[PDB]
Amino acid sequence: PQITLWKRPLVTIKIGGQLKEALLDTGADDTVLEEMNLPGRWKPKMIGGIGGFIKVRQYDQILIEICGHKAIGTVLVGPTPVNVIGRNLLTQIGCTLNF
Amino acid sequence: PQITLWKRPLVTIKIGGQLKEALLDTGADDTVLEEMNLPGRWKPKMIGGIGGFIKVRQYDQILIEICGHKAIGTVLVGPTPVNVIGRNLLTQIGCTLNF
Ligand SMILES: CC[C@H](C)CN(C[C@@H](O)[C@H](Cc1ccccc1)NC(=O)O[C@H]1CO[C@H]2OCC[C@H]21)S(=O)(=O)c1ccc2c(c1)CC[C@@H]2O
């Protein structure tokens, strides 16, 4: 599909057996999702942006479906105000910017 | 152009007659640039990101050229970790997401 940017580019994703809403975010290196109790091992990380840093849990090789497109990679879980699909997964679903 | 996302989507911008590097950020509603001198009036504003809120100087109706495409719109100036081009200007240059 083609998504215009008049409004936030929100899509439905499937992760951990749950459906959520997330932004297709070309400014996020990696994917960051709202607090969720995923199974498996993780490693602590600190990620910074406007306003400062938040603490997150880094889970590797997590399966995510984004608008029916399957992907697998790193997901950072923590107290983010929004779910963002980052470049690490956007490349996997074939997403580009065009103008 | 069609821009893939294996690397950060960094581009050259022109604002106030100076060239700069900036990130095309579909997850940003607004455009936020690092501290710089900009002519004209401005009003104090607050913006929130992943890590909380910061104080910015809001410049309205500013000419800015992004990878050869002209825009005129609001530019927030303040202690952002990186220059971000957000949707208020991405729409002006006709940028969409495609996969
Ligand atoms: C530094 C470049 C940008 C800022 C990096 N961000 C991604 C941007 O799209 C954020 C997304 C977002 C965060 C909160 C609420 C809504 C949207 N938008 C943003 O701040 O927008 C501002 C300006 O416009 C306004 O509208 C929205 C908020 C205001 S990040 O979320 O901070 C991030 C993600 C992954 C990762 C990191 C850092 C570090 C490694 C890891 O990979």
Q: Cα(B34)–Cα(B9) distance, rounded to whole angstroms?
A: 17
Number of other residues whose CB lies within 10 A of the CB of residue A43? 9
Tokens of B83: 């220059």
Tokens of B3: 């821009």
CA of B84 to the centre of ligand 1 (A): 9
Resolution in A: 1.9
What are the helix (H) ranges across B12-95? Answer: 87-90
Q: Cα(A60)–Cα(A41) distance, rounded to whole angstroms?
A: 8
Residue type (1 letter), B31: T
Q: How many domains does chain A have?
A: 1
Does residue B61 come out as left (phi exceeding 0), alpha (psi in the -120 to 50 range) or beta? left
A50 with B80: Cβ contact below 8 A: yes
Residues of B in contact with A6 (CB under 8 A): 87, 91
Give the CA diameter of chain A. Answer: 41
DSSP state of A91: G
Contact (CB, 8 A) for A94 and A24: no
Q: Cα(A15)–Cα(A76) distance, rounded to whole angstroms?
A: 12
Smallest CA–CA distance from B93 into chain A, residue: A99
If DSSP codes are grouped into helix, strand and coil, which group holds residue B11? strand
Q: Cα(B78)–Cα(B84) distance, rounded to whole angstroms?
A: 11
Burial class (CB in 10 A: 0-12, 13-18, 19+), B2: exposed
DSSP state of B29: S
Task: Compute the C-alpha angle B90/A55/A18, nearest 5°.
Answer: 70
Backbone angles phi, psi at A89, to 5 degrees: -100, -30
Q: Cα(A1)–Cα(B53) distance, rounded to whole angstroms?
A: 33
What distances in angstroms separate CA A5 from CA B10, B49, B53, one per listed residue? 18, 18, 23
Rg, C-alpha atoms of chain B: 13
Residue type (1 letter), A38: L
The secondary element (H helix, E strand) that includes residue A92 is none
Residue A84 CA neighbour count, 13 Å, CB half: 26
In 3D, which of B88, B49, B65, B51 has the Cα closest to residue B13? B65
If DSSP codes are grouped into helix, strand and coil, which group holds residue A93? helix
Contact (CB, 8 A) for A25 and A13: no
Residue located nearest, by CA, to atom 32 of ligand 1: A49
* Separation of first and last alpha carbons in chain B: 15
- Catalytic site residue A30? no
**Residue range of the domain that includes A86:** 1-99
What distances in angstroms separate CA A2 from CA A99, B42, B51, B94, one per listed residue? 12, 35, 30, 12
Residue B3 bridge partners (DSSP)? A97
What are the helix (H) ranges across A1-99? Answer: 87-90
